Amino acid sequence: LMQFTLPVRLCKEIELFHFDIGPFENMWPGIFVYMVHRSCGTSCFELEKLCRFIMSVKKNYRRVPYHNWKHAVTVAHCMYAILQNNHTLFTDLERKGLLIACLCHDLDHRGFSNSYLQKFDHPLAALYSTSTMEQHHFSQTVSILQLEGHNIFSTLSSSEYEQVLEIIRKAIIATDLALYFGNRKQLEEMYQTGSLNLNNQSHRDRVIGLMMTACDLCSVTKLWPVTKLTANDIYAEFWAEGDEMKKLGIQPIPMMDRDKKDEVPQGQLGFYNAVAIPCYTTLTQILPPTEPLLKACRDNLSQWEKVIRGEE
Ligand SMILES: Cc1nc2cc(C(F)(F)F)c(CCc3nc(N4CCCC4)nn3C)nn2c1C
Numbered sequence: 001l002m003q004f005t006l007p008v009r010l011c012k013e014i015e016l017f018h019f020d021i022g023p024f025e026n027m028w029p030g031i032f033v034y035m036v037h038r039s040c041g042t043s044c045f046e047l048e049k050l051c052r053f054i055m056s057v058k059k060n061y062r063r064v065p066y067h068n069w070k071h072a073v074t075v076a077h078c079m080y081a082i083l084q085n086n087h088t089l090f091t092d093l094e095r096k097g098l099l100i101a102c103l104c105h106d107l108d109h110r111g112f113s114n115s116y117l118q119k120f121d122h123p124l125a126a127l128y129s130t131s132t133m134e135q136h137h138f139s140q141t142v143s144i145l146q147l148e149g150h151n152i153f154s155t156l157s158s159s160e161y162e163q164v165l166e167i168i169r170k171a172i173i174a175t176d177l178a179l180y181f182g183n184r185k186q187l188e189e190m191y192q193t194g195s196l197n198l199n200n201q202s203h204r205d206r207v208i209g210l211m212m213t214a215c216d217l218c219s220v221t222k223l224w225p226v227t228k229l230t231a232n233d234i235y236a237e238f239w240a241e242g243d244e245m246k247k248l249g250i251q252p253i254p255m256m257d258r259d260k261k262d263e264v265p266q267g268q269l270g271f272y273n274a275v276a277i278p279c280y281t282t283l284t285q286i287l288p289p290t291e292p293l294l295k296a297c298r299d300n301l302s303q304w305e306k307v308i309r310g311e312e
């Protein structure tokens with residue numbers, strides 16, 4: 001059969017948590033197929049259907065600075081690296097579902113937060129009152145799965161099919177950072193009082209939600225230059241949202257106000273202490289081989305500290 005293979009530097013570095021998928025857009029599909037084949041098998045999906053699904057997914061990501069096709073493939077690579085470092089902890093269905101979930105998790109993102117859609121009074125905010133974009137992203141995922149020739153799950157039973165779509169739904173809802181805080185507190189408490197039980201489906205669900213937050217944030221776990229240049233894309237979106245808030249007559253919060261450019265180093269520190277470090281710490285407690293994500297995060301935190309001390 002037809003194995004996908006990568007040039008040697010990519011074949012070695014793609015196994016590491018800090019791998020950057022590179023600026024060559026045309027290689028990103030092959031990089032994803034490579035990762036499905038190794039984390040799932042050459043048997044998981046019909047090659048033709050999978051290729052047709054990947055290209056329709058790509059086409060439904062928009063040309064925004066951050067929440068774009070490159071982000072989708074980046075989040076999927078982090079998941080690949082978690083799965084490959086925790087071989088025997090996951091079901092066959094989870095292996096199938098989570099890479100697809102990660103590829104799909106920001107489908108048809110417009111570069112605006114749930115908060116901005118609610119203030120603009122966008123139709124999606126009446127259709128979905130919480131996790132607005134995330135319920136959209138899962139809805140776009142089902143759309144694409146139902147196009148002709150796009151059912152990559154066509155070999156599962158009705159109940160295996162329903163279970164995979166349920167893993168994907170919860171994984172995508174979990175990328176709503178508003179939900180992350182409470183999910184990580186519960187996991188922290190369950191880990192610390194020894195109640196954490198991976199045979200309990202509601203426990204697995206929480207663990208997969210935390211993996212989703214971890215993959216979604218993995219830009220803070222790259223080499224410093226990748227971390228820093230990504231943060232420019234992230235802010236380019238947030239600042240355009242801030243401009244849109246000012247057009248609605250609403251002073252945006254400082255994170256979104258390009259006039260507060262200077263405070264970015266300190267906003268990144270708060271973010272690493274409040275979200276990132278706690279995320280990768282609890283993840284490392286539950287899945288010890290994901291520790292390189294925590295260690296990279298802590299290295300980037302110390303790089304933002306140097307930026308504030310004027311040494312960078
Ligand atoms: C991968 C990645 N993911 C996220 C998510 C976010 C957030 F969720 F906070 F929006 C942030 C922004 C963090 C931030 N900046 C600021 N301001 C900057 C100047 C004034 C205050 N406040 N805060 C909390 N960065 N970020 C990155 C780099």
Ligand SMILES: [Mg+2]
Nearest residue numbers: 105106133175
């Ligand atoms: Mg999202």
Ligand SMILES: [Zn+2]
Nearest residue numbers: 105106175216
């Ligand atoms: Zn995302």
